[PDB]
Design a binder for these strands. Structure first.
Length: 63
DNA sequence: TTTTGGCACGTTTC
DNA sequence: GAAACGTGCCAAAA
């Protein structure tokens, strides 16, 4: 929690668009991996961020 | 089924 | 007086 100007912003799209665009993550799953490396942001925040950056859900982009 | 939006609180500083 | 940041549950939407 209590991150910078975008320590979870400039990261949610920089890993998800690099892994498996044919098998996307979710606001829970991205919130989880971000706790393993230094962000420890919850799903409530990360949801509001993939909204503001530019992602509709990535499920709807993939399917 | 899965993924996600609206409402409210904690914190600190102005 | 108020903002800003992440964050707790609820139900809504595909």
């Amino acid at each position: 929690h209590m991150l910078t100007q975008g320590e979870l912003m400039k990261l949610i799209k920089e890993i998800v668009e690099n892994e498996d665009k044919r098998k996307p993550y979710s606001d829970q799953e991205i919130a989880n991996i971000l706790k393993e490396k230094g962000f420890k942001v919850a799903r409530r925040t990360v949801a509001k961020y993939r909204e503001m950056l530019g992602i509709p859900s990535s499920r709807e982009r993939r399917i």
